[PDB]
Structure formats: C-alpha cells, structure tokens
Amino acid sequence: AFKPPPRPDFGTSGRTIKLQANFFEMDIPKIDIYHYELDIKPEKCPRRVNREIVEHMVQHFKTQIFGDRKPVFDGRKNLYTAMPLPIGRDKVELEVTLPGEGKDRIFKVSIKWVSCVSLQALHDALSGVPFETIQALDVVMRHLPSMRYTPVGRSFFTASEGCSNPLGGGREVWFGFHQSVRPSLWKMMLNIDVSATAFYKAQPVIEFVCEVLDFKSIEEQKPLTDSQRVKFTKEIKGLKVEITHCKRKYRVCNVTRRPASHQTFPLQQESGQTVECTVAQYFKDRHKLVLRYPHLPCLQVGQEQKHTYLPLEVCNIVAGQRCIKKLTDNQTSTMIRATARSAPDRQEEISKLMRSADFNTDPYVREFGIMVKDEMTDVTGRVLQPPSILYGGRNKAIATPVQGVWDMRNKQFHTGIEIKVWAIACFAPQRQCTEVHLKSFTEQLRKISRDAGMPIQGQPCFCKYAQGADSVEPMFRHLKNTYAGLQLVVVILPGKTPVYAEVKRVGDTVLGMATQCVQMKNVQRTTPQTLSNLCLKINVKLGGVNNILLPQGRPPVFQQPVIFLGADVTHPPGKKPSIAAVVGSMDAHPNRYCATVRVQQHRQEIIQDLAAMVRELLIQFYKSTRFKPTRIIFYRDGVSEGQFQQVLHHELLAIREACIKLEKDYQPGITFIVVQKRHHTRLFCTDKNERVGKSGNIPAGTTVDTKITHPTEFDFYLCSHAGIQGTSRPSHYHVLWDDNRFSSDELQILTYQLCHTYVRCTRSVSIPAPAYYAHLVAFRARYHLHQALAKAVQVHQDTLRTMYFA
RNA sequence: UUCACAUCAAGUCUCUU
Ligand SMILES: [Mg+2]
Incomplete structure (x- = not known):
C-alpha cells in the first residue's frame, strides 16, 4: 500500500x-x-x-x-x-x-x-x-x-x-x-x-467601490447602507491596498461599520494620556488632510489591533492581484x-x-x-472502438455511438417506468406560465415519453401554483398524504431561486420523493431534444434503466462480480466544510448507483470517513445482487501527483479496512485509479482529416500512453468525449494500485466504456460515470446545505437507494 | 433548474491609526 x-x-x-x-x-x-x-x-x-x-x-x-x-x-x-x-x-x-x-x-x-x-x-x-x-x-x-x-x-x-x-x-x-x-x-x-x-484592476479604492456597487459617479453622498457595505467588505477583505499620502501594500482584514467621521481609535497624547480620536480628525491634525469622503467607511489593516483604519480615498488597489x-x-x-x-x-x-x-x-x-x-x-x-449501447423496447434497438454521440430516435429505454401518478408544482407566476403553457408542455412531454419507452399515463393528478421556499413542504406533505402511489413531482422554476435548494432538500431528505425541475423558459417553449433529455433524468430517478452496455462487448472483468466506485471531494472558497462523496455500482450493467456523502475538514482532499462510506456501498451491492464484489475498481477524482502517496496511504487502507470489517478473510482485488482533468496537456491532430467538428479536436476514444506519459508507472491519457467547443481536455488516469493485474488495453477499454454509462445524456463523457456521479452528489449536497451538518446531508431512507442526484 | 462540451505561496514593516 x-x-x-x-x-x-x-x-x-x-x-x-x-x-x-x-x-x-x-x-x-x-x-x-x-x-x-x-x-x-x-x-x-x-x-x-x-x-x-x-x-x-x-x-x-x-x-x-x-x-x-x-x-x-x-x-x-x-x-x-x-x-x-x-x-x-x-x-x-x-x-x-x-x-x-x-x-x-x-x-x-x-x-x-x-x-x-x-x-x-x-x-x-x-x-x-x-x-x-x-x-x-x-x-x-x-x-x-x-x-x-x-x-x-x-x-x-x-x-x-x-x-x-x-x-x-x-x-x-x-x-x-x-x-x-x-x-x-x-x-x-x-x-x-x-x-x-x-x-x-489597479485602481483607487474609491473607483473600486463604484464598480462593485455599480455606481456611475461616486456621489449619485450619504453613508453606505448595511446592504451596500457588506458586499463591498466581502469583495475587498483579503486584498492588498497601498498608501498614496506618505510602496507599502497592506493587507485588508475588515471594513469598519462607522464612517471616517465617527470611526475612532485610541490616540496617545504627548502627556502620556490616551484619548479617542476620529480617523477624520487625525488626518486633519497629523496629515493636514481634510477628508473628501468622510461619510465613507475605513479599511482596517494589520491585526485586530493596533487599529489602523485607513480612509478609502488614500488607498489604491495593489496591482497583480488574482x-x-x-x-x-x-x-x-x-x-x-x-x-x-x-x-x-x-x-x-x-x-x-x-x-x-x-x-x-x-x-x-x-x-x-x-x-x-x-x-x-x-x-x-x-482511437478505441466505442461500445454498442443497448436499448430496450420491442425491437431491442442497438445504438452505435458515432463521434462520442448517439441518438434515441426509434429507440426505447431498457426498462422504462410506467408513470401513472404524478404532480406539477409551478413556482413561476401564472402571468408568465399559463395553464395553456403547462398543458401544451405536458402534451408535448407525454408524447416524447411515449416513444421513449417510458409512457406517462394521462394528466397529472395534481397541479398548483406557489411562491417562496416556505410553500414547498406544506405542498409536499400534502402530496405524499393525499396521493397514494405518487411517483414524480414536476417543479417549475422562474430562473434562479433558493426554492430549488428547498425542493431538493425536502424531496431527498424529508419526504423522500423524486422531484424533476424545469425552468420557466423551457415550459413556455419546448423542444423534442430538451424534452427527451428530461425523460432521461426522470426514468433513472424512478429507478429505471435508460440503457446498458452491450453484454457481449465487455471487458473480461465483468465475468465475476465487481463494484465500480467513484469518489470526489468539493471545497468551499467561508469557514464552510469540504464535502466528500463516494458512489458505487449496484448491478452488473453497470447502471444503477448508490450515493454516500460526508462533511469534513475545510480544504481537505483526503476522504476521512472513507472506510465507512465504502462499507455502506458494499452492503448495498449485496442487497441488490446477492454478490460480494471480487474486485473493487476505484476512480478517484481531483488528486495531484504530489498527493499520490498521501491518498494512497489513507484511502487504500480505508477500502481494505472496510473489506475486513465485513468479513475477516474478504480480500477483493482493488484497483485504485486517479482521474485528472485539471492539467495542461493538450493533444492536437496532425492530419486535418482527423479533426472533428470545427472545434477541430481529437475524436472520442483517442488514447495516449506513450511518449509523453510516465517512464515507469501505469498511466495514460484518454479523451473519451467529443469536443464541442474550444480545446478538449484529454482526461489523465494514473494507476496507484492494482491487485487485479489489469493490462493497458483492458483497463483503457473498460475506462472508455464506463464513459458511455452516463444517463443524463446520450453522449460519451470526459470522465467515467462513477467519477461524474460523485461530483453531482457532492454538488447536490451543496444545495442540501457540526453534527447538524452531517444530518443536513443525510438522504431520506427510500431515496437512499436511488440516483436522486441525476 | 434538459444536457454535454468548455471553465498551487507569508506585504507581519518605517512613531504608520
Ligand atoms: Mg475534486
């Protein structure tokens, strides 16, 4: 290890x-x-x-x-x-x-x-x-x-x-x-x-105040309100400022509430006695300077002490600050x-x-x-050959990916779910979103559902309008109580709103029922493609299978039971905690995933409670397949080279610790792979005939494990996605551990096929689904907002075994 | 919130407030 x-x-x-x-x-x-x-x-x-x-x-x-x-x-x-x-x-x-x-x-x-x-x-x-x-x-x-x-x-x-x-x-x-x-x-x-x-931009703080508070001129003055001030403080706290009045950049720590005319500090007179002196008066006495904007606050520098308040008009923003x-x-x-x-x-x-x-x-x-x-x-x-993606229906339509993309036309879900009971909650004003809009949308929606292999049976049993995040649960309690067998709630939102945070909070933690969201603009005007991608999200949210990898076209690793793990930890900028999320496959396709999520130390890539999370996922794998994984494939996201030996020492053991807490002699082969998109290695096509799309990138499946890779260790590049804009990032993979004795071809092909199991789109994605799902979990958990914190992030028991993060 | 692609360095000082 x-x-x-x-x-x-x-x-x-x-x-x-x-x-x-x-x-x-x-x-x-x-x-x-x-x-x-x-x-x-x-x-x-x-x-x-x-x-x-x-x-x-x-x-x-x-x-x-x-x-x-x-x-x-x-x-x-x-x-x-x-x-x-x-x-x-x-x-x-x-x-x-x-x-x-x-x-x-x-x-x-x-x-x-x-x-x-x-x-x-x-x-x-x-x-x-x-x-x-x-x-x-x-x-x-x-x-x-x-x-x-x-x-x-x-x-x-x-x-x-x-x-x-x-x-x-x-x-x-x-x-x-x-x-x-x-x-x-x-x-x-x-x-x-x-x-x-x-x-x-290297400009005086006065001008800086304007751009932050959207001022035309300085005056347009009176003291800043409590509103205008906290935004300015949040934008300048931690930045360096320099003195114009009499090369010494000082680091801003806070912005005073009181204006320069009233903000005071203890000044020691020449008679030993100290006295309270305003910053405005001190600049008059000491610097012969009558403040031009005494109604404006003071930047506070050094420590909490000594004091050191500086008026905004004598400070500039130090150049070269990212x-x-x-x-x-x-x-x-x-x-x-x-x-x-x-x-x-x-x-x-x-x-x-x-x-x-x-x-x-x-x-x-x-x-x-x-x-x-x-x-x-x-x-x-x-360029590796893409796996055939298998759909259901009556024709068993097999789709063949072309340049990282395939379609769902004339094709139907592997196991589509029969939606029979569902509600609609429109949080957009009825003036914008009318009953005609909803009805149209719905009729358009159902029609897609039909050909998708996931038929919606008739009108929604419930349909109401609302406003505020406070109106979420009283409606949500009402729905679960008055509608037996309620499957889906379609929440409609007007752009950006904290309602979504509450909708996902209640729906995933409190009541535990699937809630698909859609913006107002996508209801007012509907497209077959957008509606189709919605059907991709609601089928999996109701425990359905959109599509699976072609069984015969799979690596020799699927011959025995195997779980695929995906891990990623996201960090806050305030004193908020980091969120670690670990997912795991729950079938042999692989398609269905369960999600564990924890909170930990501020800025900490090491998944602390990893052993517990892996333990839970292993239990769920047995609860779904009666099978104990003979192999553990682990895709760790967001680890740099300098941290490899760190995460390998703690996270490899943690997985091993989880295996032996279950059973003493349960030692499945563990493959530890770290996936990286945060690097600066780009690949370009020599021939102009190999360029794809007028973004002109390398085709999906381009694998590089020679020339520019590690001289001794098992690493490779794999651009599994189709570049749509700019320059593509060839995802890098580095094998830190492998009991399974993988070969280069088998592991690279396996990694490539896992990029075709992402259910939110009919495309091949940049990172394998487990790694991508883990990001979604730790991002959904950020909308879920100590031990309170651990509780806030805990998912309802019935949504505990669903891809709610989809 | 249809979706994908795209999207790691100490200013602590000089009678200074
Ligand atoms: Mg990360």
Missing part, C-alpha cells in the same frame, strides 16, 4: 492517429549542478521580495562570490548554479539593504552548500526517479519568467499592453501561460499551454469568450508563445546548457 505498480504493457487496441502534444523535448547536459541553501532574515518575506533581494545580492557581491555566473532562485531557500560557487563548502553571511518606502533597510542573507545535483543520474532514470533533480530544472526554467511576470501557481500572467479586458466589479482579464517540467520516457518534457485568469472569488455568470462567459479559440487555433497560440518566449536564448537556461525544441512532440494515439 506504498508504491504504485509499474506499467504492465502499452496495449494495441484502436486505430492509430497522429497527434502532437504541447510537450517540448529538452536537451539536458550530463554535468553536475550545485545547490545552495539560503537563510534570509527576516524569513517571512513573500517570494517576490526575496527574489529581488537575491537578485541585488548577486549583482552586489559580484567580485567576491558570484562573478559572471548566472544563478537561479527558488524564491524561498534554494539557489542553483551551473558551476561551483567559491563557497568551497563552508557557510557565508551576507548583508543587503534595499530601498525602502522611507526607511531604506535591511536583509541578512547567508549561503550554505547542500549537494551536487546529478543530471546524468536523471538520464539513467529516464531509461528504465530524482524529484530533487526535477525540481532544479523547474527552477532554471522559471527563474526568468518569475522575475518579469506575475507568478500564479505554475503559471505566469501579465497585464495587457494591450487589450485591457474588463469584467466589471474591479475585475479584469490577464492573459498568461503555464510552464512545467515533466518526465517521460527517454526525454524530459517542457509542458507549455496558454492560460487566462481574472485579476483585480481574483479567487468565483465570477458572475457573465464574467465567466466573457472570460471563456477570450480563451476558447479551437484546438487548431490554440495550437498556434502556443507556437506563437514558444516563439516569443525563445527559451534557446534565455540567459539562465543557456547558462545551464539546456536546450528546448520549437516543435510539438509527435505522438501516436489509438
């Missing part, structure tokens, strides 16, 4: 396709490079500051220490050099003083040698693995960009010269790129990809508008980026003798 398995083989399935990956080969010298450690005093300075200190330190001590050498820097505590520094071995203490805001002051730095980073040893590892050596290369690579650009994670960003793209609310668009050094067989790869994220807060429906949209391009389009943008970057002329990488190709790596992919 400690070390991931080696790659078993490469696999031969599918027909070859020629691809290029945004990976650029690196030529690394066989030399040894030298590692030094740095003790900077004070040691709590951010990387940007340390970088400047070190940059000045290298220039200043030119003659004695560095000379004509060009050392790179961690930003924290590591410096690397191409040839040995004249440290010799023993520690040296250096002093730097830099320009200050007005104090002009001090930094104590010292160098000590640590080791000799062997690059030749790295070459050997790439031929059948030194993280430390890899970390050194990253530093050599991003030493320069880190100086000129704004480092964000493993990416860089700069302000447009330029476009200057707004988003409103003080937010603006910054275009950037990602750079990372990746290992692969034989070669070291430089992963490059174009990026774009939100940043706060926006962490999620953005409005539109801001996201216009951001995507900027990004999206298409796969051919973005491949040029990377090449354009590689052209301007010009690594082969970088002073620091020339120093280290490193060379990088200007052409994308050429890889062969295999």
